[PDB]
Design an enzyme around this catalytic site. Sequence first.
Site, short mmCIF file in Angstrom:
data_model
loop_
_atom_site.label_atom_id
_atom_site.label_comp_id
_atom_site.label_asym_id
_atom_site.label_seq_id
_atom_site.Cartn_x
_atom_site.Cartn_y
_atom_site.Cartn_z
N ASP A 290 24.39 -32.58 -2.72
CA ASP A 290 24.34 -31.08 -2.78
C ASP A 290 24.80 -30.49 -1.49
O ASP A 290 23.68 -30.60 -0.70
CB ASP A 290 23.30 -30.62 -3.57
N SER B 225 21.33 -23.60 -10.42
CA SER B 225 21.48 -22.93 -9.09
C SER B 225 20.66 -21.56 -9.08
O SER B 225 19.26 -21.78 -9.42
CB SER B 225 22.87 -22.72 -8.64
N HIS C 50 26.95 -30.16 -6.11
CA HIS C 50 26.21 -28.86 -6.47
C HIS C 50 26.53 -28.76 -7.94
O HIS C 50 25.80 -28.36 -8.74
CB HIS C 50 26.67 -27.78 -5.60
#
Length: 261
Positions: free
Chosen positions: A176, A130, A207
Site C-alpha cells: 500500500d 481506507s 491499496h
Amino acid sequence: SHMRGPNPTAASLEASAGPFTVRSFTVSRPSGYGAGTVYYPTNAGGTVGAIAIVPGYTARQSSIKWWGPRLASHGFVVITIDTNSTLDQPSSRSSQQMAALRQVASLNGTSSSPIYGKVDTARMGVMGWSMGGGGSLISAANNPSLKAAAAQAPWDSSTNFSSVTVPTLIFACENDSIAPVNSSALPIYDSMSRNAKQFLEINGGSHSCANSGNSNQALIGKKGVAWMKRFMDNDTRYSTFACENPNSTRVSDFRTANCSL
C-alpha cells in the site's frame, strides 16, 4: 448465540457465495447519507444482523459491492453506501455509516420494504475501505454496542483507537503506497488493547487489495464472513476460522489478540 446455516468449512467460506439466497434493492429516500444498496437473504431462519459498508475518498459502492452478496448469502442484511460527498472525511463517513444502520432498522419496520422483518436490529456491524475503514473504527469507538468491525486498508488522521472494545478485523495490503501499513494499518491495529482483534496483511497487495475484483476473494471473504459470524452471531463454530493463522502464501503477515479458540 444466533446460529443460522450449516457448520462451515474452510472450503465453503472460500466459495463465491454462502448457503442463503440474496436479492438487493436501491434505497428510495436515503436518510443522512448519499445512496444505499440493501442486500438481504430470504430464507435464513431467523432474523440476521445488519452491516453498513463505506468506501474511501472519491469512491462509490463499486469499490466495496462484492461484500454485499458475499456476507448476505451467509445470514446478514448489508447496506453499501455512497456518501453525501465523494470528498467526505472519516468522521463524516462514520456519521453516514451509522445513519445507514439507522435506516436499515427503519426499513425493517416498513411493510413496503423487501427486508421487512428480515433484520435483527440489536446485532450490527461496520466495515469500510481506507477513509471508510477509518470511519468504521470511529463508528466502533463511538458505539461500543456494535458487535463487530472490519476495516480494509484503513486511514485516519490519528492512529489511536485505544477506546475500541468492539472485535476488530484489519485487512492490510502489503505494498500500500496510499495508506502504507507501517504508518496506518499496523499502528491502528497496535493501538487496540481492550478488544478481540486481528490483522491480515495481503502479500504484495496494493491499496485496493480487498476491493471488488481482487485476486484474494477466497481468503478475504472467508475471513470477513468468519469474523462477522463469530462476533455478530456469537457463533463459536466460526472461532476456528475467525482466529486461525492462515497457512497461506497469499498472507505476508498475521496478528491476533483476545480471539479465543
